[PDB]
Amino acid sequence: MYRVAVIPGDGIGPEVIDGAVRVLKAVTGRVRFEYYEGGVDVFQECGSPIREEDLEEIRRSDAVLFGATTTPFDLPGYRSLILTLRKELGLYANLRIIPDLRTGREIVIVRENSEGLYFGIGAVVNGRAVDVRLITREGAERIARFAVEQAKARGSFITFVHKANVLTGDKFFRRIVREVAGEEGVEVRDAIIDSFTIKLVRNPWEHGVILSENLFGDILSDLATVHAGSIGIVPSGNYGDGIALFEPVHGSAPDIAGKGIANPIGAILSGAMLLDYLGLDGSLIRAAVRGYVVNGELTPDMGGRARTEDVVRGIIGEIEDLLSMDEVW
Amino acid sequence: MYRVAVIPGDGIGPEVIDGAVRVLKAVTGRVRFEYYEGGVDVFQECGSPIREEDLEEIRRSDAVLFGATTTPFDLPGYRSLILTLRKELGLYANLRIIPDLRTGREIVIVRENSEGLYFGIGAVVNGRAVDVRLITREGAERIARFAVEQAKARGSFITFVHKANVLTGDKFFRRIVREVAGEEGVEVRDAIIDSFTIKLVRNPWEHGVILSENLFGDILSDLATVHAGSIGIVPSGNYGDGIALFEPVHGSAPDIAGKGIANPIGAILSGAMLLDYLGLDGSLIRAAVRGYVVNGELTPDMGGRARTEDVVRGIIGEIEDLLSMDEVW
Ligand SMILES: CC(C)[C@H](C(=O)O)[C@@H](O)C(=O)O
Ligand SMILES: CC(C)[C@H](C(=O)O)[C@@H](O)C(=O)O
Ligand SMILES: [Mn+2]
Ligand SMILES: [Mn+2]
């Protein structure tokens, strides 16, 4: 059996993760689920958003499934759970795939996930505050290589988005992405971060494998969800050299917490990416979702009257009708 | 007479500036125009994109009117003309106003223009490159004050866009904007930079006076031009304590250089903001533009068959019919 750590978190996190796990429990029985708490409640007990001993289990699990976590702005001392996990598990590649769920079309973003303006060097002294945007050869190379493999796997190219006209680190980053992509025969198109926002809303689907620094990727990936109906359909994988974590891009949405209306598709499809990463069958979850979308009613954030549970039951439905036959058929 | 330095630059810069100056020459004769060269040609002669002696004139002029400038990525040693001028003239406030030119509606952005990731501290050493995002008390305060005056003047509020969940400097910046806006009774709404891209495309007009760090402002302001028809209608002012510079947000577009199709409205309306700054009548240029838009044919970038000259002649037209009467009437 494969060993998967599950971190529902809070707000709507438990809701959409209930959905994604049930869907996973319906395409395979080769996965054992271990649940851990995390977020403010755990901070207030222990001074950390995750317990040291739990973190020790989690780093030895085969993969991680993560919901969402509320990070209150006005709580001093508190590190975001997800940033902690990203750093603790060496997760340097954030892959966000924004689907138009009528057509087959995708926006594919590779967000560097370990450095940039997230590297953690910051300070205030005497009315002068700084944050240090760090790009390292090793950081550049390995996210470049990750990106070329997503290009190749798709017979595509890389759009490297940057501000190398202003940022020394983006000049450096650019050399290295061109070097690795050349060494491997992949085309790299330049894009500048400000004008690329325009290209990204007007012309969504012509950009290949988009690659950028950590914070730029953060920004572009939220923006790209204008093209799916809602940020709530969009999944991600955070990959490192020995483990990966999967979470929906959406947040913990405590407004609609417990109202039973949250969109589980982001979590579900993030479950798909987790099966892929384990060498199991994510395609089934994807196909099950495309099929349910055709006629199925959606959640309010997408515009329908449907409850979370109707979407979940409906997709399991389509899955059951796929496992009813062999891989062939 | 008022003394205005003019820097057409290159590509379509001369074209759209010809238009904006003629329009200015048609609403007032109280302004003398002095022309200076700038950009790569001047770099190659002198090693600078602007001559020292010309810069000395320009810093003593009453205001600056600037077109656009090509900054080739593959030319070593070259500082962008506009970044140079921004820094040399102490221009710390970048105000970009994106109009929907049917309705009266505007997106109003105050981009901090002297620090942030533009402050200029960057280096590469041993496969480690950095850029330092600097926020200073003095930088925060004065862009905060500039922003409250745009709020008050409109009976509005500030939306402060940031990533203070990750960036120490944005935490600092936030304190200071809240302090000055409170001290002056202006509401400040928080917005986070990634989710604000979504709000900015779906819900453009409900954000008041948007304020952010330098690079965030760069990014948001290009994005906000999806709501005007084209980046080519959008003007800006770069303001400092003793001088200001006005330029269209668009770039030098060397593709359509000399084809006679470039949209002059961004430059023209930037001329409007320059008359305002001199205590002359920008409103006339604005009204002249709203009137010409109703039925007038536009340039290809907006979708019409019209040439640059037809737009320019047309707006002068509407201006002439405004100066035909007194201020009253
Ligand atoms: C919550 C925040 C720290 C996180 C990030 O900034 O990466 C989130 O916005 C996301 O995009 O995953
Ligand atoms: C050309 C570039 C240096 C400039 C900037 O980044 O500020 C431009 O993109 C703009 O927005 O004015
Ligand atoms: Mn984000
Ligand atoms: Mn820009």
Side-chain angles (χ1 to χ4, degrees), chain A residues 163 165-166 194, chain B residues 80 82-83 86 96 111 118 214 218 222 247 249:
Chain A
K163 194 79 194 197
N165 44 344
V166 173
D194 56 351
Chain B
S80 215
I82 188 62
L83 300 170
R86 286 182 191 166
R96 293 169 171 206
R111 164 182 173 183
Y118 287 68
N214 205 320
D218 182 58
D222 263 39
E247 66 175 333
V249 178

Side-chain angles (χ1 to χ4, degrees), chain A residues 130-141:
Chain A
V130 309
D131 289 280
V132 181
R133 196 174 108 116
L134 173 67
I135 311 294
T136 68
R137 186 161 327 258
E138 322 89 60
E141 278 196 36

Side-chain angles (χ1 to χ4, degrees), chain A residues 96 111 118 218-219 221-222 249, chain B residues 163 194-195:
Chain A
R96 293 169 171 206
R111 164 182 173 183
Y118 287 68
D218 182 58
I219 294 166
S221 59
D222 263 39
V249 178
Chain B
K163 194 79 194 197
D194 56 351
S195 34

Side-chain angles (χ1 to χ4, degrees), chain A residues 69 71 80 82-83 86 94 96 111 113 118 214-215 217-219 221-222 247-250, chain B residues 163 165-166 192 194:
Chain A
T69 179
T71 299
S80 215
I82 188 62
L83 300 170
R86 286 182 191 166
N94 192 307
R96 293 169 171 206
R111 164 182 173 183
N113 204 44
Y118 287 68
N214 205 320
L215 181 63
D218 182 58
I219 294 166
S221 59
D222 263 39
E247 66 175 333
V249 178
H250 71 77
Chain B
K163 194 79 194 197
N165 44 344
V166 173
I192 310 285
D194 56 351

Side-chain angles (χ1 to χ4, degrees), chain A residues 36-57:
Chain A
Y36 305 89
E37 294 150 335
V40 313
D41 311 347
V42 181
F43 173 65
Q44 276 164 342
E45 283 311 273
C46 274
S48 202
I50 192 73
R51 303 179 155 117
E52 227 317 308
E53 66 273 14
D54 284 349
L55 176 54
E56 282 332 285
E57 302 300 7

Side-chain angles (χ1 to χ4, degrees), chain B residues 16-51:
Chain B
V16 303
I17 288 289
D18 175 76
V21 161
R22 286 161 55 188
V23 167
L24 284 170
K25 263 168 164 155
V27 343
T28 179
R30 291 237 263 153
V31 167
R32 202 211 314 150
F33 295 99
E34 260 126 44
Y35 285 76
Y36 305 89
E37 294 150 335
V40 313
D41 311 347
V42 181
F43 173 65
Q44 276 164 342
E45 283 311 273
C46 274
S48 202
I50 192 73
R51 303 179 155 117

